[PDB]
Amino acid sequence: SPTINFINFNQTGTCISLGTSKGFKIFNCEPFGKFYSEDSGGYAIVEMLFSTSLLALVGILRIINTKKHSIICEVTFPTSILSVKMNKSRLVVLLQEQIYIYDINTMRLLHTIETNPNPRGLMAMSPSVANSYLVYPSPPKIKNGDVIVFNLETLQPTMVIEAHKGEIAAMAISFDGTLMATASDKGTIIRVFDIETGDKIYQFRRGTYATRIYSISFSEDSQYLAVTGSSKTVHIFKLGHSRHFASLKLPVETNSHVMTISSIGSPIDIDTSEYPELHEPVMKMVPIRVVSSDGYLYNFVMDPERGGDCLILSQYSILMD
Amino acid sequence: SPTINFINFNQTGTCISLGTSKGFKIFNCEPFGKFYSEDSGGYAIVEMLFSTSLLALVGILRIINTKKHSIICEVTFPTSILSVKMNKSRLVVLLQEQIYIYDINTMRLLHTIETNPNPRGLMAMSPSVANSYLVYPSPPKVIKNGDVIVFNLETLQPTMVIEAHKGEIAAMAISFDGTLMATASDKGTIIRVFDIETGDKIYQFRRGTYATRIYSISFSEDSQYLAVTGSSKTVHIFKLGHSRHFASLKLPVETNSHVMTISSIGSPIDIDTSEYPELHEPVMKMVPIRVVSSDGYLYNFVMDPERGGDCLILSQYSILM
Amino acid sequence: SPTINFINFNQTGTCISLGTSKGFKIFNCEPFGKFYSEDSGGYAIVEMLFSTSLLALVGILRIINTKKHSIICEVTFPTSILSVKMNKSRLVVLLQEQIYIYDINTMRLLHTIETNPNPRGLMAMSPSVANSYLVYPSPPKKNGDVIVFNLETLQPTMVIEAHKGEIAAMAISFDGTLMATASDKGTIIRVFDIETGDKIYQFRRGTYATRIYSISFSEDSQYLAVTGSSKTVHIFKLGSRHFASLKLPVETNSHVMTISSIGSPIDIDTSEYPELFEEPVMKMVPIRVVSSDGYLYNFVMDPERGGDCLILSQYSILM
């Protein structure tokens, strides 16, 4: 089993990107299958658009169309790339002290921001062109958790958010580009700010003792927020409005030193006759897909009313098949 | 009489720097005199610190100590320099699209800012190290055209973004202590001053009757008054002790209308009313105002802080003679 | 996640020395971070001085400087190296039946002690050069005899009858004034004055058979920390019954070896931790526990109440 270095959903949560030490793979979610693969070499960053056969590959920057098996262009940078995010309008490249913004269509350089160092390569980017926003942390050279709200459409900053007292650990933007959620390096407080005005809307407490946070992600309908940390547990905070609404516990066999990213899908019908949820024949269950760095996928279901600990239905392997 | 290309006061308003097409000159204000001069060549930027025998010289960037007649350093830039400002802590050089910040002591480069093009070379520098702030305009790259970026020089991180005006910014000025910032649109009809730490607009002034260009803005030492000069050959004084201009400075009629005019406001001094029939106690405090124009003349005025109104002119010298 | 083979603090308790089957890493405690790492190979003992970019490497003996990336010297021994400890004056290598003493500056050999076998590789060093001592057990070839060896003049000073049974763990305070030992049954702690040899303190611990692994003093010697196999760490005050206790979370791997070290009191912010531990700042003595499974745990104790201590954080070494 080759070592994997990168896992990410697409901007809609219906696909899986992945990168190994020997190549990269592309899966699907509902009719699970391996759409694409390539045994080139070590890949560190594999980012995909809303399907559409467009990929960004960073070896351990090249953009490739997988349907045509051709290369659009290759871009070199003085320093190593730390993060890459896309929407159907702009292409963003982050280095440890520089942010590069490209037009996804014409691929010409548009802007460059000289920022204070970001060793963690943190970003959050709105995927919708109607509200194309970019946010990145602004540490000083107590004013540690300042985040710069940058508008990609006009290429100008909009406001400065005094998010947290300590360094920012993770940040995400809803699908429509309306909200933003950030967490400090202690991972004890989750705060949600409205990117339009900047006022803090929601503040959530995560866990008891300070533990690291890996990734934050909204639902497609912005109903729930998902956080994943070193506790081998995934919390879900309900944004329909403190304490997490419902929590996800991986099986005890899973190694505790695994990176976990998750995503929440649209509610769908499941059969209660087959599954003793403990009864109407069918009720709508919110699906959550959790993939771990060891190479497994987990499917949970969440009751929007009951919440609580979520049942697990199935489990796959992303390596091999 | 050689043509002059650049005039400005020092950060305290008690000295004069000037640049001709044949050299530069340095004057003094109260015991008027010519401290220094060199007929080297064309000079476009001659900026001085708080006396201290330190100068920035740009040919038609070199740092020269006038007392020692030596060269501290010499630095080149890819494009022409548009503005240079200093405090006793930082040195700022602005090109049309780039801002360079240098430490005044070590002279090593500290930061670089990539901004949207500023053909007008507009900035504002706080001269006090306690509140060292730099503000530069951020127009959209091709209504929100008058966006200005509040940048902190101490920590080298921006603090907030101020939506100053609807149209492009034409002039900026920061008080001596770095507390307030004043901005002027390209129409020169509305003068707005913002409190830099909070960001709220404190005062709003109407200037003149019809729209006309504004040359420069400058605060008093005690932030009591604000001086603006425009193409109407009239200088207005706005009282910040708290609309309409408090007092107006009318130059003599024989003066050419196409003259760049910069001004400064000094601390109140005792003047003898026996010599000057102000229209009476022997002495009364009157604020002295020095207005040097691009034709090469200095004009001394006095304002009565209670009466205000049209100001009397005491004397006129002639720079370059 | 490669397996680790050595985990230990520095002489001040403000760093983490850790060596894996693939390399070694050097961490920090309050501003947690990865100071250094090399993927060279299997390392059995990685010991560090008071920062100062000095390391000792034992393969699964070489002294390296991490700042200059150079090798000072390499020395071989007839048997496997069991333990290495350092201070600002002396370097000591312990083997199965021999103890080697080196000058940390010159690297010249100074003295060699012929001791009865030590299968556990037990020794303790005073880290201060003012009272540079070395203590090691002396089993008969009268079981818990500890030889107080003066590294300053290279001569033993006195012999203490510590315990009737085998000695399990020994430690010397930072100032080199006190010595603490624990028997093989791990129920009684004895603290001796290294100058005179009088028994000063006696502590009770381990109601059932839980072996004692490590003993450590605080910087001010106010507290004594003992870690055993029971997944619970006791704190004794040197001002009988234990003063405070540490309970690791149950989810942790039980097949682990845990050490600990107590630091100087610091201030913690209440606003950072909304759920647990909720005066914006309080003085709480920090306790750092690292286990072989690869996790660093931080606990805090109230200097007056004591009791069971909260856990502020749990960071992940090797990542």
Residue numbers in the entry:
A (entry chain C): 5 to 64, 75 to 155, 222 to 321, 409 to 445, 458 to 500
B (entry chain A): 5 to 64, 75 to 156, 222 to 321, 409 to 445, 458 to 499
C (entry chain D): 5 to 64, 75 to 155, 223 to 320, 409 to 447, 459 to 499
Sentences from the study reporting this entry:
Interestingly, once dialyzed into the low-salt buffer (100 mM KCl), Atg18 formed large supramolecular structures when imaged in negatively stained EM samples. The assemblies exhibited a pitch of ~100 Å with 5.1 helical units per turn. D Fourier shell correlation threshold at 0.143 indicates resolutions of 3.8 and 3.3 Å for the 3D structures of Atg18-WT and Atg18-PR72AA, respectively. The determined cryo-EM structures of Atg18-WT and Atg18-PR72AA constitute two main propeller interactions mediated by the T and I-interface between neighboring monomers. Interestingly, the lipid binding sites appear buried in the T-interface of the helical tube suggesting a stabilizing role of the involved residues. In line with the highest affinity, we found that PI3,5P2 binding leads to disassembly of the helical tubes.
Autophagy-related protein 18 (Atg18) participates in the elongation of early autophagosomal structures in concert with Atg2 and Atg9 complexes. The corresponding primary structure contains a series of conserved WD40 repeats forming the 6 or 7 blades of a β-propeller fold. The autophagic membrane adapter Atg18 reveals an unexpected structural plasticity in multiple modes of oligomeric organization.
